[PDB]
Design a protein around this ligand. Structure first.
Ligand SMILES: CC(C)Oc1cc(CN2CC[C@@]3(C[C@@H]2C)CN(C)S(=O)(=O)N3c2cccc(F)c2)ccc1O
Ligand SMILES: [Zn+2]
Ligand SMILES: [Zn+2]
Length: 394
Protein backbone atom coordinates (compact mmCIF):
# COMPACT_ATOMS: atom_id res chain seq x y z
CA UNK A 1 0.00 0.00 0.00
CA UNK A 2 3.14 2.23 0.41
CA UNK A 3 3.12 3.03 -3.36
CA UNK A 4 -0.56 4.19 -3.19
CA UNK A 5 0.04 6.70 -0.35
CA UNK A 6 -0.32 10.28 -1.68
CA UNK A 7 -1.85 9.05 -4.96
CA UNK A 8 -4.56 11.77 -4.75
CA UNK A 9 -4.20 15.50 -5.44
CA UNK A 10 -6.47 18.40 -6.24
CA UNK A 11 -7.41 22.00 -5.53
CA UNK A 12 -9.44 22.92 -2.41
CA UNK A 13 -13.18 22.51 -3.09
CA UNK A 14 -12.50 21.06 -6.58
CA UNK A 15 -12.45 17.40 -5.59
CA UNK A 16 -9.66 14.86 -5.27
CA UNK A 17 -8.22 13.10 -8.32
CA UNK A 18 -6.07 10.04 -9.06
CA UNK A 19 -3.89 9.50 -12.14
CA UNK A 20 -5.21 6.82 -14.50
CA UNK A 21 -4.30 5.44 -17.88
CA UNK A 22 -6.72 4.36 -20.55
CA UNK A 23 -6.07 2.48 -23.80
CA UNK A 24 -3.09 0.95 -25.65
CA UNK A 25 -0.69 2.79 -25.64
CA UNK A 26 -1.73 4.30 -22.23
CA UNK A 27 -3.24 7.81 -22.29
CA UNK A 28 -2.74 9.55 -18.92
CA UNK A 29 -5.66 11.38 -17.38
CA UNK A 30 -6.49 12.77 -13.94
CA UNK A 31 -9.73 11.33 -12.64
CA UNK A 32 -12.07 12.65 -9.91
CA UNK A 33 -12.57 10.00 -7.13
CA UNK A 34 -16.31 9.88 -6.65
CA UNK A 35 -18.03 7.60 -4.15
CA UNK A 36 -21.25 9.49 -5.10
CA UNK A 37 -21.63 7.97 -8.59
CA UNK A 38 -21.04 4.73 -10.53
CA UNK A 39 -19.80 5.57 -14.07
CA UNK A 40 -16.24 5.76 -15.26
CA UNK A 41 -16.47 8.66 -17.75
CA UNK A 42 -13.72 10.76 -19.39
CA UNK A 43 -13.59 13.95 -21.49
CA UNK A 44 -13.21 12.62 -25.08
CA UNK A 45 -13.64 15.85 -27.09
CA UNK A 46 -12.04 19.32 -26.77
CA UNK A 47 -13.47 21.41 -23.95
CA UNK A 48 -12.44 24.93 -22.87
CA UNK A 49 -11.63 23.57 -19.37
CA UNK A 50 -9.84 20.36 -20.55
CA UNK A 51 -6.05 20.47 -21.26
CA UNK A 52 -6.31 16.92 -22.72
CA UNK A 53 -8.88 14.23 -23.38
CA UNK A 54 -9.35 10.56 -24.25
CA UNK A 55 -8.69 9.90 -27.92
CA UNK A 56 -10.33 6.50 -28.69
CA UNK A 57 -8.90 6.47 -32.24
CA UNK A 58 -5.40 6.27 -30.65
CA UNK A 59 -6.14 3.04 -28.65
CA UNK A 60 -5.58 -0.35 -30.34
CA UNK A 61 -7.56 -1.96 -27.45
CA UNK A 62 -10.68 0.25 -27.61
CA UNK A 63 -13.99 -1.49 -28.42
CA UNK A 64 -16.98 0.77 -29.22
CA UNK A 65 -20.21 -0.45 -27.54
CA UNK A 66 -22.27 1.45 -30.19
CA UNK A 67 -24.45 3.02 -27.45
CA UNK A 68 -24.71 6.54 -26.12
CA UNK A 69 -25.39 7.56 -22.49
CA UNK A 70 -27.07 10.77 -21.15
CA UNK A 71 -26.28 11.76 -17.58
CA UNK A 72 -28.06 14.82 -16.17
CA UNK A 73 -27.80 16.19 -12.61
CA UNK A 74 -29.19 19.26 -10.85
CA UNK A 75 -25.93 21.23 -11.21
CA UNK A 76 -24.56 19.84 -14.48
CA UNK A 77 -24.57 17.14 -17.12
CA UNK A 78 -22.62 15.10 -19.58
CA UNK A 79 -23.41 12.91 -22.58
CA UNK A 80 -21.11 10.41 -24.25
CA UNK A 81 -20.38 7.19 -26.05
CA UNK A 82 -20.00 3.83 -24.34
CA UNK A 83 -17.17 1.43 -25.04
CA UNK A 84 -14.52 -0.65 -23.31
CA UNK A 85 -10.76 -0.29 -23.00
CA UNK A 86 -7.76 -1.27 -20.90
CA UNK A 87 -7.69 0.89 -17.77
CA UNK A 88 -4.99 1.23 -15.14
CA UNK A 89 -4.16 3.24 -11.96
CA UNK A 90 -0.28 3.80 -12.12
CA UNK A 91 -0.14 4.58 -8.37
CA UNK A 92 -2.62 1.82 -7.62
CA UNK A 93 -2.78 -1.98 -7.93
CA UNK A 94 -0.15 -3.46 -10.32
CA UNK A 95 -2.92 -4.63 -12.75
CA UNK A 96 -4.62 -3.49 -15.95
CA UNK A 97 -8.30 -4.28 -16.39
CA UNK A 98 -10.88 -4.02 -19.24
CA UNK A 99 -13.55 -1.60 -18.05
CA UNK A 100 -16.51 0.29 -19.40
CA UNK A 101 -15.58 3.85 -20.38
CA UNK A 102 -18.09 6.56 -21.20
CA UNK A 103 -16.41 8.91 -23.71
CA UNK A 104 -17.76 12.38 -22.83
CA UNK A 105 -18.58 14.25 -26.04
CA UNK A 106 -20.85 17.05 -24.72
CA UNK A 107 -21.05 18.47 -21.18
CA UNK A 108 -22.48 21.38 -19.27
CA UNK A 109 -21.11 22.55 -15.89
CA UNK A 110 -19.41 19.20 -15.38
CA UNK A 111 -15.66 20.01 -15.77
CA UNK A 112 -14.22 22.77 -13.50
CA UNK A 113 -11.68 25.38 -14.68
CA UNK A 114 -8.23 24.68 -13.18
CA UNK A 115 -9.33 21.54 -11.22
CA UNK A 116 -6.69 19.55 -13.26
CA UNK A 117 -9.03 16.54 -13.70
CA UNK A 118 -10.52 15.24 -17.01
CA UNK A 119 -12.82 12.43 -15.97
CA UNK A 120 -14.66 10.77 -13.12
CA UNK A 121 -14.20 7.45 -11.27
CA UNK A 122 -17.68 6.54 -10.01
CA UNK A 123 -16.95 4.11 -7.11
CA UNK A 124 -20.54 3.45 -6.04
CA UNK A 125 -22.70 0.47 -7.06
CA UNK A 126 -24.25 -0.72 -10.32
CA UNK A 127 -27.74 0.26 -9.11
CA UNK A 128 -27.03 3.91 -9.85
CA UNK A 129 -24.89 3.36 -13.00
CA UNK A 130 -26.14 5.07 -16.20
CA UNK A 131 -27.94 4.16 -18.43
CA UNK A 132 -28.85 1.22 -16.15
CA UNK A 133 -27.44 -1.40 -13.68
CA UNK A 134 -26.09 -3.71 -16.50
CA UNK A 135 -23.22 -1.21 -17.09
CA UNK A 136 -20.70 -2.75 -14.78
CA UNK A 137 -18.81 -0.13 -12.71
CA UNK A 138 -15.01 0.12 -12.68
CA UNK A 139 -14.47 -1.35 -9.21
CA UNK A 140 -16.73 -4.34 -9.96
CA UNK A 141 -14.56 -5.05 -13.12
CA UNK A 142 -11.37 -4.61 -11.09
CA UNK A 143 -12.48 -7.16 -8.47
CA UNK A 144 -13.90 -9.63 -11.03
CA UNK A 145 -10.88 -9.62 -13.38
CA UNK A 146 -8.04 -9.61 -10.79
CA UNK A 147 -7.37 -10.88 -7.23
CA UNK A 148 -7.92 -7.32 -5.83
CA UNK A 149 -9.92 -7.56 -2.55
CA UNK A 150 -13.41 -6.00 -2.58
CA UNK A 151 -12.49 -2.96 -0.50
CA UNK A 152 -10.90 0.43 -0.92
CA UNK A 153 -10.11 3.13 1.64
CA UNK A 154 -9.72 6.91 1.37
CA UNK A 155 -7.56 9.25 3.41
CA UNK A 156 -8.48 12.79 2.26
CA UNK A 157 -6.02 15.32 3.71
CA UNK A 158 -5.90 19.08 4.42
CA UNK A 159 -5.55 22.11 2.10
CA UNK A 160 -2.88 34.12 -3.58
CA UNK A 161 -3.48 33.50 -7.32
CA UNK A 162 -4.61 29.88 -7.00
CA UNK A 163 -6.62 27.60 -4.69
CA UNK A 164 -4.69 25.52 -2.13
CA UNK A 165 -3.46 22.12 -3.25
CA UNK A 166 -4.88 19.09 -1.32
CA UNK A 167 -3.32 15.67 -0.94
CA UNK A 168 -4.68 12.26 -0.12
CA UNK A 169 -4.55 8.49 -0.54
CA UNK A 170 -6.84 5.94 -2.19
CA UNK A 171 -5.78 2.53 -1.01
CA UNK A 172 -7.24 -0.03 -3.45
CA UNK A 173 -7.78 -3.57 -2.05
CA UNK A 174 -7.02 -2.93 1.60
CA UNK A 175 -6.39 -0.95 4.77
CA UNK A 176 -3.15 0.92 5.50
CA UNK A 177 -2.67 1.06 9.25
CA UNK A 178 -0.16 3.97 9.12
CA UNK A 179 -3.08 6.14 7.87
CA UNK A 180 -5.11 6.11 11.07
CA UNK A 181 -4.88 6.12 14.87
CA UNK A 182 -7.20 4.49 17.39
CA UNK A 183 -10.06 2.16 16.45
CA UNK A 184 -11.74 1.65 13.09
CA UNK A 185 -15.52 1.69 13.77
CA UNK A 186 -17.97 0.33 11.17
CA UNK A 187 -21.40 1.48 10.09
CA UNK A 188 -23.54 -0.84 7.87
CA UNK A 189 -24.06 0.01 4.20
CA UNK A 190 -27.88 0.29 4.28
CA UNK A 191 -28.34 -0.62 0.61
CA UNK A 192 -25.82 -0.99 -2.20
CA UNK A 193 -26.58 1.93 -4.56
CA UNK A 194 -24.91 5.02 -3.11
CA UNK A 195 -22.76 4.31 -0.03
CA UNK A 196 -25.90 4.75 2.07
CA UNK A 197 -25.59 4.89 5.87
CA UNK A 198 -27.90 5.72 8.84
CA UNK A 199 -27.28 8.60 11.30
CA UNK A 200 -29.01 7.86 14.64
CA UNK A 201 -28.15 11.03 16.65
CA UNK A 202 -26.66 14.50 16.01
CA UNK A 203 -25.01 16.67 18.69
CA UNK A 204 -23.64 20.24 18.40
CA UNK A 205 -21.16 20.88 21.32
CA UNK A 206 -22.49 17.88 23.25
CA UNK A 207 -26.06 19.13 22.90
CA UNK A 208 -28.54 16.78 21.23
CA UNK A 209 -30.43 18.32 18.26
CA UNK A 210 -33.56 16.51 19.59
CA UNK A 211 -34.97 15.48 16.26
CA UNK A 212 -36.71 12.28 15.14
CA UNK A 213 -33.67 10.42 13.74
CA UNK A 214 -35.57 9.79 10.42
CA UNK A 215 -35.05 13.58 9.74
CA UNK A 216 -31.24 12.93 9.72
CA UNK A 217 -31.71 10.40 6.87
CA UNK A 218 -34.45 12.21 4.88
CA UNK A 219 -34.43 11.06 2.10
CA UNK A 220 -31.08 9.28 2.49
CA UNK A 221 -27.60 9.73 4.03
CA UNK A 222 -24.60 8.97 1.80
CA UNK A 223 -20.78 9.10 2.10
CA UNK A 224 -19.66 11.14 -0.98
CA UNK A 225 -16.01 11.96 -1.75
CA UNK A 226 -17.22 13.92 -4.81
CA UNK A 227 -19.04 16.57 -2.70
CA UNK A 228 -17.07 19.23 -0.79
CA UNK A 229 -19.59 20.12 1.92
CA UNK A 230 -21.36 18.47 4.76
CA UNK A 231 -24.84 18.74 3.23
CA UNK A 232 -27.82 18.43 5.58
CA UNK A 233 -31.61 18.06 4.93
CA UNK A 234 -33.54 21.41 5.22
CA UNK A 235 -34.87 20.92 8.86
CA UNK A 236 -31.57 19.44 10.14
CA UNK A 237 -29.61 22.28 8.41
CA UNK A 238 -31.89 24.92 10.07
CA UNK A 239 -31.35 23.31 13.53
CA UNK A 240 -27.53 22.99 13.10
CA UNK A 241 -27.15 26.68 11.98
CA UNK A 242 -29.34 27.95 14.89
CA UNK A 243 -27.15 25.81 17.24
CA UNK A 244 -23.87 26.98 15.59
CA UNK A 245 -25.06 30.66 15.58
CA UNK A 246 -25.88 30.15 19.33
CA UNK A 247 -22.31 28.99 20.30
CA UNK A 248 -20.54 31.67 18.17
CA UNK A 249 -22.99 34.51 19.16
CA UNK A 250 -20.10 36.89 20.12
CA UNK A 251 -19.60 37.24 16.32
CA UNK A 252 -22.41 38.68 14.21
CA UNK A 253 -21.65 37.31 10.77
CA UNK A 254 -23.92 38.31 7.85
CA UNK A 255 -26.58 36.02 6.32
CA UNK A 256 -24.34 35.47 3.26
CA UNK A 257 -21.85 33.69 5.51
CA UNK A 258 -24.40 31.06 6.74
CA UNK A 259 -25.49 30.45 3.12
CA UNK A 260 -21.79 29.85 2.17
CA UNK A 261 -22.01 32.88 -0.16
CA UNK A 262 -19.58 35.11 1.79
CA UNK A 263 -16.27 34.80 3.62
CA UNK A 264 -15.59 35.88 7.24
CA UNK A 265 -12.12 37.05 8.24
CA UNK A 266 -9.95 37.53 11.33
CA UNK A 267 -6.48 39.04 11.69
CA UNK A 268 -3.84 36.50 10.52
CA UNK A 269 -3.82 33.66 13.08
CA UNK A 270 -6.37 35.16 15.50
CA UNK A 271 -9.22 32.82 14.43
CA UNK A 272 -11.37 32.28 17.56
CA UNK A 273 -11.75 28.50 16.90
CA UNK A 274 -13.01 27.98 20.49
CA UNK A 275 -16.31 29.84 19.82
CA UNK A 276 -17.25 27.33 17.15
CA UNK A 277 -18.73 24.05 18.39
CA UNK A 278 -17.77 20.45 17.51
CA UNK A 279 -20.39 18.46 15.60
CA UNK A 280 -20.88 14.77 16.37
CA UNK A 281 -22.79 12.43 14.03
CA UNK A 282 -23.67 9.13 15.67
CA UNK A 283 -23.73 6.35 13.05
CA UNK A 284 -25.64 3.06 13.39
CA UNK A 285 -23.18 0.32 14.60
CA UNK A 286 -22.81 -3.27 13.46
CA UNK A 287 -24.70 -4.40 16.61
CA UNK A 288 -28.44 -3.62 17.13
CA UNK A 289 -28.94 -0.68 19.51
CA UNK A 290 -25.23 0.25 19.23
CA UNK A 291 -23.77 3.31 17.58
CA UNK A 292 -20.45 5.19 17.37
CA UNK A 293 -19.79 8.89 16.89
CA UNK A 294 -17.61 10.79 14.47
CA UNK A 295 -16.72 14.25 15.85
CA UNK A 296 -15.77 17.03 13.45
CA UNK A 297 -14.02 20.26 14.40
CA UNK A 298 -14.75 23.81 13.06
CA UNK A 299 -11.42 23.47 11.23
CA UNK A 300 -13.27 20.93 9.02
CA UNK A 301 -16.48 22.95 8.49
CA UNK A 302 -14.91 26.45 8.13
CA UNK A 303 -12.96 26.08 4.85
CA UNK A 304 -9.93 28.45 4.40
CA UNK A 305 -10.03 30.73 1.29
CA UNK A 306 -7.09 33.10 0.57
CA UNK A 307 -8.36 36.67 0.02
CA UNK A 308 -6.08 38.34 -2.59
CA UNK A 309 -7.45 41.78 -1.51
CA UNK A 310 -6.84 41.04 2.23
CA UNK A 311 -3.81 38.70 2.35
CA UNK A 312 -3.15 39.78 5.99
CA UNK A 313 -6.33 37.95 7.17
CA UNK A 314 -7.48 34.35 7.61
CA UNK A 315 -10.84 34.08 5.73
CA UNK A 316 -13.27 31.17 5.81
CA UNK A 317 -16.29 29.77 4.00
CA UNK A 318 -19.07 27.93 5.89
CA UNK A 319 -19.02 24.45 4.37
CA UNK A 320 -22.33 23.09 5.78
CA UNK A 321 -25.19 23.57 3.34
CA UNK A 322 -28.90 22.83 2.80
CA UNK A 323 -30.00 19.70 0.90
CA UNK A 324 -33.33 18.55 -0.58
CA UNK A 325 -31.84 15.08 -1.34
CA UNK A 326 -30.69 13.95 2.10
CA UNK A 327 -27.45 14.15 4.09
CA UNK A 328 -24.21 14.21 2.17
CA UNK A 329 -21.06 13.41 4.09
CA UNK A 330 -18.63 15.15 1.76
CA UNK A 331 -14.97 16.18 2.10
CA UNK A 332 -15.89 18.24 5.23
CA UNK A 333 -16.63 14.97 6.96
CA UNK A 334 -14.03 12.75 5.22
CA UNK A 335 -10.96 14.98 5.80
CA UNK A 336 -11.05 14.23 9.56
CA UNK A 337 -10.98 10.46 9.00
CA UNK A 338 -9.58 7.36 7.35
CA UNK A 339 -12.65 5.99 5.56
CA UNK A 340 -12.88 2.30 4.74
CA UNK A 341 -15.33 1.28 1.96
CA UNK A 342 -15.62 -2.39 2.93
CA UNK A 343 -17.76 -3.60 0.04
CA UNK A 344 -16.96 -7.26 0.88
CA UNK A 345 -18.58 -6.80 4.34
CA UNK A 346 -21.19 -4.19 3.26
CA UNK A 347 -19.95 -1.65 5.85
CA UNK A 348 -18.09 1.72 5.95
CA UNK A 349 -15.30 2.08 8.56
CA UNK A 350 -14.22 5.37 10.18
CA UNK A 351 -11.05 5.98 12.18
CA UNK A 352 -9.17 9.17 13.23
CA UNK A 353 -6.90 10.22 10.31
CA UNK A 354 -3.12 10.34 10.78
CA UNK A 355 -3.46 13.63 8.71
CA UNK A 356 -6.50 15.41 10.33
CA UNK A 357 -6.27 19.24 11.12
CA UNK A 358 -6.47 20.08 14.88
CA UNK A 359 -5.67 22.57 17.69
CA UNK A 360 -4.16 22.04 21.15
CA UNK A 361 -7.61 21.87 22.83
CA UNK A 362 -9.81 19.57 20.62
CA UNK A 363 -9.31 16.74 18.05
CA UNK A 364 -11.60 15.14 15.47
CA UNK A 365 -12.73 11.85 17.06
CA UNK A 366 -14.25 8.42 16.33
CA UNK A 367 -15.69 6.92 19.58
CA UNK A 368 -17.87 4.09 20.75
CA UNK A 369 -19.95 2.27 21.59
CA UNK A 370 -23.11 4.32 22.43
CA UNK A 371 -26.44 2.60 23.29
CA UNK A 372 -30.22 3.26 22.97
CA UNK A 373 -33.15 1.12 24.14
CA UNK A 374 -36.39 0.41 22.14
CA UNK A 375 -34.76 2.50 19.36
CA UNK A 376 -36.98 3.27 16.31
CA UNK A 377 -35.76 2.76 12.68
CA UNK A 378 -33.94 5.96 11.54
CA UNK A 379 -33.98 4.93 7.87
CA UNK A 380 -36.38 6.63 5.42
CA UNK A 381 -38.21 4.69 2.68
CA UNK A 382 -38.22 6.62 -0.57
CA UNK A 383 -41.73 6.84 -2.15
CA UNK A 384 -41.80 4.18 -4.92
CA UNK A 385 -42.42 5.66 -8.35
CA UNK A 386 -44.33 3.58 -10.92
CA UNK A 387 -41.30 3.97 -13.32
CA UNK A 388 -38.93 2.47 -10.67
CA UNK A 389 -41.46 -0.28 -9.82
CA UNK A 390 -42.03 -1.25 -13.51
CA UNK A 391 -38.31 -2.13 -13.87
CA UNK A 392 -37.47 -5.85 -14.12
CA UNK A 393 -34.28 -7.00 -12.42
CA UNK A 394 -32.73 -9.89 -14.42
C1 LIG B 1 -15.71 18.37 -7.18
C2 LIG B 1 -17.07 19.03 -7.24
C3 LIG B 1 -16.97 20.43 -6.67
O1 LIG B 1 -17.52 19.21 -8.59
C4 LIG B 1 -18.00 18.06 -9.21
C5 LIG B 1 -18.36 16.93 -8.53
C6 LIG B 1 -18.84 15.83 -9.23
C7 LIG B 1 -19.27 14.61 -8.46
N1 LIG B 1 -20.74 14.64 -8.08
C8 LIG B 1 -21.09 15.79 -7.21
C9 LIG B 1 -22.54 15.67 -6.78
C10 LIG B 1 -23.50 15.62 -7.94
C11 LIG B 1 -23.13 14.51 -8.88
C12 LIG B 1 -21.66 14.54 -9.27
C13 LIG B 1 -21.37 13.23 -9.97
C14 LIG B 1 -24.89 15.29 -7.40
N2 LIG B 1 -25.54 16.56 -7.04
C15 LIG B 1 -26.99 16.45 -6.73
S1 LIG B 1 -25.07 17.80 -8.08
O2 LIG B 1 -24.65 18.98 -7.35
O3 LIG B 1 -26.01 17.91 -9.16
N3 LIG B 1 -23.65 16.97 -8.57
C16 LIG B 1 -22.90 17.60 -9.61
C17 LIG B 1 -22.12 18.68 -9.28
C18 LIG B 1 -21.45 19.39 -10.25
C19 LIG B 1 -21.56 19.02 -11.57
C20 LIG B 1 -22.37 17.95 -11.91
F1 LIG B 1 -22.49 17.60 -13.20
C21 LIG B 1 -23.08 17.26 -10.94
C22 LIG B 1 -18.96 15.90 -10.60
C23 LIG B 1 -18.64 17.06 -11.29
C24 LIG B 1 -18.17 18.14 -10.58
O4 LIG B 1 -17.80 19.32 -11.20
ZN1 LIG C 1 -38.66 -9.32 -17.30
ZN1 LIG D 1 -31.65 -5.50 -14.94
Amino acid sequence: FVEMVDNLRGKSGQGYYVEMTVGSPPQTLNILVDTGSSNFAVGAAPHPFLHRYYQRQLSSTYRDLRKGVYVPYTQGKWEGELGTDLVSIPHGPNVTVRANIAAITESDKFFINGSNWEGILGLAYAEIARPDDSLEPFFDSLVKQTHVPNLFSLQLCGASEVLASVGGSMIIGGIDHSLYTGSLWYTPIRREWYYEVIIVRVEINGQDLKMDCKEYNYDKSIVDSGTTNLRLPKKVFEAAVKSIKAASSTEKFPDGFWLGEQLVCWQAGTTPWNIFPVISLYLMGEVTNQSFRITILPQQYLRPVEDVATSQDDCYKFAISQSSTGTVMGAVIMEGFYVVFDRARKRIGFAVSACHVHDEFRTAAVEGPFVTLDMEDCGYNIPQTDESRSHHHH
